[PDB]
Amino acid sequence: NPTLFVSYDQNGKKLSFANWISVLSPQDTPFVSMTGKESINQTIFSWQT
Amino acid sequence: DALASVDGNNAHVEGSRAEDGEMKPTVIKSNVTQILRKVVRVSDTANTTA
């Protein structure tokens, strides 16, 4: 039987979750982000020199 | 219908007691359907190239 209702007897919360997630795992991929890409037809290929 | 081409003799002289007849019934044959199948597994590989 409270008489003040101070931030503890307030039933029916919402939990005010956030709208994001922190994936702190390392995703740094400089080699891949620097090297280009090219669409190849078949699995095997070759290059002259 | 099995026409029963067998003719023979069924003669009667002047008033012979009409026999009970020799009617022939029909014969029914029947068939059934077969099921065919052609399977293919190979994917779209063999394109190692670009």
From TrEMBL, chain A:
What is the name of this protein?
A: Major head protein
Q: Which residues of the full protein are shown?
A: 3 to 51 of 352
